[PDB]
């Protein structure tokens, strides 16, 4: 089926222009059967429709954005993009691209969605990547990684390059008094596996273009 | 703009129950109403369009009805994976969403499994020590965690973080992180977290010695 | 004479005036609407120089009385997010320059499902 992928900055300074790109695969952008939309979600303001573009390039916008948003399409690369000008903290949100269908008896609906990209509007100077420390293990044993002192959100954590998923819990980030975030990711594993199996947490911090792989071992 | 409203704001129901969620439009929107399901950390997912048309591949336990101003989403046999926020959305005027209804799952009591993690030696080179206490796979969410340093009850220096309900077994997990300076950590020896929860007949304490 | 636009139910449409302007001229643009089943929908003005600021001089309440969204208006263009029978009919664009010009274009918007 059709798939959508967003990409763009995590951190944008106030008064600058947020720029995001959605890439479409498993389909093309060449028919008035579909429109291509941007939607955002913020804890405060819920889900908000931004606007959409037709395959011929006609755009239609939510008036609430005060014409600060520009949607463009490049059908060649099967991509479409969003530019939001004069950004303020109120534009901090998860931005989603999606496909729109319509019909004479239903009107518009959003049938496939990208995974969303968090864009933080802040006057902070530059992003910061995380330090990663082991939560060493002692029937069932628990181990983890402490991911400390990064900005802005988010960080994604996998274990063993995605091969270990059962029993993983990654906690919500917490904003420390220092202005930086931290979280822990933990996994429970058979205690007999501790000596035979390698455990590595893969920590991805896209806002700072940083990835950290940390092996977690029993302590000597 | 058209104001979409939803009721209840949140609900708790047991596996197998039948739950209905209500969505109201501020003006008539014909049947131009969509329902989306959003699971923790995922994009919203289309469930129903045109008020009553189930999207392909959506389970037949989801059902929509309504035309005009009043709409209903009925989940006829609630499942653990249905833990989600459900949103209605209108397509008659400038596209607008309702605020969502949170569906929580009621299950039986489950006692937490408790683990304690000392600061890594590597972190201590930063002048900061993080001690981590993990409460794993428990229900209900309510719990208390106390940090004791050489039997001195700690206060004001720990933070707590809880996952959303697990999609398979409806439990929670929680992390309590105690933050000390390296000096403070190196001056004391016994570090312990004590957990009180409904499913524990008496508080569970996990401790380590070093620092 | 008429620029004919065929539209489908609950599809958007855009009316694009064949607009040509001279740098430094003040322009006012109006859109008027004659429904199938007169009314100035909107009037905007600006000095001609995407990056084009304009002032919204007037707006009509017609669609609001029908609990429908009025067309969105930009220099040279009228947009309707969702087609319905009340948007069908004749639209007239008139743009007047401080250099003395007055330009008109007329659009006929009809429903695709009615043949001939």
CA distances in angstroms from B107 to B61, B111, B198, C92, listed in the order given = 20, 12, 13, 64
Which residues, 6 or more positions from C40, have their beta carbon under 8 angstroms from its beta carbon?
A: C30, C31, C32, C58, C60
**Within 13 Å, how many C-alpha atoms sit on residue B166's CB side?**
20
- Helix, strand, coil shares of chain A, percent, nearest 5, are 5, 55, 40
Containing H/E element for B122?
Answer: helix B121-124
Q: State the DSSP code for A109.
A: E
Contact B172, B138 (CB under 8 A): yes
Look at the domain A131-216 and name its fold: Immunoglobulin-like (2.60.40)
Interface probe for A, chosen from C5, C14, C52 (most Cβ of A below 10 Å), is C14
CA distances in angstroms from B54 to A3, A46, B20, listed in the order given = 20, 24, 16
φ and ψ of B74, to 5 deg: -110, 130
* Options 3.10.180.10, 2.60.40.10, 3.20.20.70, 1.10.3720.10; CATH of B4-106: 2.60.40.10
Name the residue in chain A with its Cα closest to that of C53: A67
Comparing C-alpha atoms, which of C72, B109, C3, B122 is closest to residue A67? C72
Which residues, 6 or more positions from C100, have their beta carbon under 8 angstroms from its beta carbon?
A: none
**Chain C residues touching A62 at Cβ < 8 A:** none
Name the residue in chain C with its Cα closest to that of B1: C69
Containing H/E element for B183?
Answer: helix B182-186
Containing H/E element for B186?
Answer: helix B182-186
Q: Judge if the upstream peptide bond of residue A154 is cis by omega within 30 degrees of 0.
A: yes
Q: State the DSSP code for B93.
A: S
The whole-angstrom distance between A131's CA and the closest CA on chain B is 9
Which one of A60, A103, A106 has the shortest CB-CB distance to C81?
A60
Q: How many A/C residue pairs have CB atoms within 8 Å?
A: 24
Q: Is B118 helix (H, G, I), strand (E, B) or coil?
A: coil
At residue A7's C-alpha, the angle toward residues A4 and A13, to 5°, is: 145
> This structure's resolution (angstroms)?
1.9
Task: Tell me if C67 and B28 make a contact (CB, 8 A cut-off).
Answer: yes
CA distances in angstroms from A184 to A110, A174, C116, listed in the order given = 34, 10, 68
Query: Given CB atoms, is C112 within the 8 Å cutoff of chain A?
Result: no
Q: State the DSSP code for A208.
A: G
* CATH dotted code for B113-209: 2.60.40.10
**Chain C residues touching A54 at Cβ < 8 A:** 12
Containing H/E element for B121?
Answer: helix B121-124
**Chain B residues touching C10 at Cβ < 8 A:** 32, 91
Contact B47, B61 (CB under 8 A): no
| CA A162/CA A203 separation, integer angstroms | 11
| CA B42/CA A5 separation, integer angstroms | 13
| CA A135/CA A64 separation, integer angstroms | 47
- Is residue B155 exposed (0-12), middle (13-18) or buried (19+ Cβ within 10 Å)? exposed
Which residue shows structure tokens 């923790």? Answer: B40
Query: Given CB atoms, is C22 within the 8 Å cutoff of chain B?
Result: no
| CA A25/CA A4 separation, integer angstroms | 6
Compute the Cα dihedral for A193, A202, B174, B106 and give only its sign: negative
**Chain A residues touching B123 at Cβ < 8 A:** 131, 133, 146, 148
At A100, list the tokens. Answer: 């729109």
Strand partners, B133: B116, B176
Strand partners, A144: A135, A186
At B60, list the tokens. Answer: 């037949």
Which experiment gave this structure? X-ray
Which residues, 6 or more positions from A3, have their beta carbon under 8 angstroms from its beta carbon?
A: A24, A25, A26, A112
Contact C31, C63 (CB under 8 A): no
Contact B129, B183 (CB under 8 A): no
A57: left (phi over 0), alpha (psi -120 to 50) or beta: left
Which one of C14, C72, C82 has the shortest CB-CB distance to A107?
C82
φ and ψ of C46, to 5 deg: -175, 160
The whole-angstrom distance between B62's CA and the closest CA on chain C is 26
| CA A199/CA A181 separation, integer angstroms | 24
Q: What is the largest CA-CA distance in chain A?
A: 69
The gap between the terminal CA atoms of chain C, to the nearest Å, is 18
- Tell me the pairing of strands C39-47 and C26-35: antiparallel
Residue C81: CB atoms within 10 Å: 23
φ and ψ of B122, to 5 deg: -60, -45
Comparing C-alpha atoms, which of A36, A44, A23, A21 is closest to residue A93? A44
**Within 13 Å, how many C-alpha atoms sit on residue C70's CB side?**
18
Which residues, 6 or more positions from A43, have their beta carbon under 8 angstroms from its beta carbon?
A: none
Query: Given CB atoms, is A177 within the 8 Å cutoff of chain B?
Result: no
Comparing C-alpha atoms, which of A111, A95, A115 is closest to residue A103? A111
Contact A198, A160 (CB under 8 A): yes
Name the architecture of domain A3-121: Sandwich (2.60)
Contact A169, A184 (CB under 8 A): no
* Domain limits, chain B: 4-106, 113-209
Which one of A106, A148, A171 has the shortest CB-CB distance to B32?
A106
User: What domains sit in chain C, N to C, each tagged with a CATH number?
Assistant: 2-111 (2.60.40.10)
Query: Given CB atoms, is C66 within the 8 Å cutoff of chain B?
Result: no
- DSSP conformation letters of chain C: -EEEEEE-TT--EEEE------TT-EEEEEEEEEE---EEEEEEEEE-------EEEEE--HHHHTTSPPPEEETTEEEESS--GGG-EEEEEEEEETTS-EEEEEEEEEETTS--
Name the residue in chain C with its Cα closest to that of B26: C67
At B34, list the tokens. Answer: 């969509």
Contact B132, A135 (CB under 8 A): yes
Name all chains with 3 or more CB-CB pairs below 8 Å to chain A: B, C
Q: Is A142 helix (H, G, I), strand (E, B) or coil?
A: strand
Compute the Cα dihedral for B107, B58, A165, A130 and give only its sign: negative
Residue B206: CB atoms within 10 Å: 18
| CA A212/CA A117 separation, integer angstroms | 20
The whole-angstrom distance between B49's CA and the closest CA on chain C is 14
Query: Given CB atoms, is A208 within the 8 Å cutoff of chain B?
Result: no
Contact B56, B49 (CB under 8 A): no
């Amino acid at each position: 089926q059709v798939q959508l992928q967003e990409s763009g900055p995590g951190l944008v300074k106030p008064s600058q222009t947020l720029s995001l790109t959605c890439t479409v695969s498993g389909g093309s952008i060449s028919s008035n059967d579909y429109y291509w939309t941007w939607i955002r979600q913020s804890p405060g303001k819920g889900l908000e429709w931004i606007g959409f573009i037709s395959y011929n390039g006609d755009t239609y916008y939510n008036p609430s954005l005060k014409r600060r948003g520009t949607i463009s399409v490049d059908t060649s690369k099967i991509q479409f993009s969003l530019r939001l000008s004069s950004v303020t903290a109120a534009d901090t949100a998860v931005y989603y691209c999606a496909r729109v269908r319509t019909s004479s008896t239903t009107s518009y609906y959003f049938d496939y969605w990208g995974q969303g990209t968090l864009v933080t509007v802040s006057s902070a100077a530059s992003t910061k990547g995380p330090s990663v420390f082991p939560l060493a293990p002692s029937g069932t044993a628990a181990l983890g990684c402490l991911v400390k002192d990064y900005f802005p959100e988010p960080v994604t954590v996998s274990w063993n390059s995605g091969a270990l998923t059962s029993g993983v819990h990654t906690f919500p980030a917490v904003l420390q008094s220092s202005g930086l975030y931290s979280l822990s990711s933990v996994v429970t594993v058979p205690s007999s596996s501790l000596g035979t199996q390698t455990y590595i947490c893969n920590v991805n911090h896209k806002p700072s273009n940083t990835k950290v792989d940390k092996r977690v071992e029993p302590k000597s | 703009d058209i104001q979409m409203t939803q009721s209840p704001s949140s609900l708790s129901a047991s596996v197998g129950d039948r739950v209905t969620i209500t969505c109201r439009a501020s003006q008539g929107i014909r049947n131009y109403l969509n329902w989306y399901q959003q699971k923790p950390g995922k994009a919203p997912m289309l469930l129903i369009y045109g008020a009553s048309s189930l999207q392909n591949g959506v389970p037949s336990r989801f059902s929509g009805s309504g035309s005009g101003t009043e709409f209903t989403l009925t989940i006829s046999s609630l499942q653990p994976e249905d833990f989600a926020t459900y949103y209605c959305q209108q397509s008659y005027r400038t596209l607008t969403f309702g605020p969502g209804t949170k569906v929580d799952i009621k299950r039986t009591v489950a006692a937490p499994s408790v683990f304690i993690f000392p600061p890594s030696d590597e972190q201590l080179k930063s002048g900061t020590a993080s001690v981590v206490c993990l409460l794993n796979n428990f229900y209900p969410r309510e719990a208390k965690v106390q940090w004791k340093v050489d039997n001195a009850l700690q206060s004001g220096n720990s933070q707590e973080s809880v996952t959303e309900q697990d999609s398979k077994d409806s439990t929670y997990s929680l992390s309590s992180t105690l933050t000390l300076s390296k000096a403070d950590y190196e001056k004391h020896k016994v570090y312990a977290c004590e957990v009180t929860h409904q499913g524990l007949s008496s508080p569970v304490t996990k401790s380590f010695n070093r620092g | 004479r008429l620029i004919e636009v065929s539209v489908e139910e609950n599809h958007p449409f855009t009316l694009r005036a064949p607009i040509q302007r001279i740098y430094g001229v003040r322009y006012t643009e109006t859109w008027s609407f004659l429904p199938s089943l007169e009314d100035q929908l909107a009037e905007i003005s600006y000095r001609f120089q995407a990056d084009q600021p304009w002032i919204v001089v007037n707006t009509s309440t017609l669609f609001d009385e029908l609990e429908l969204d009025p067309p969105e208006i930009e220099p040279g263009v009228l947009k309707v997010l969702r087609t319905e029978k009340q948007y069908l009919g004749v639209y007239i664009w008139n743009m007047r320059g401080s250099d003395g010009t007055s330009t008109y274009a007329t659009f006929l918007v009809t429903w695709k499902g009615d043949e001939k």
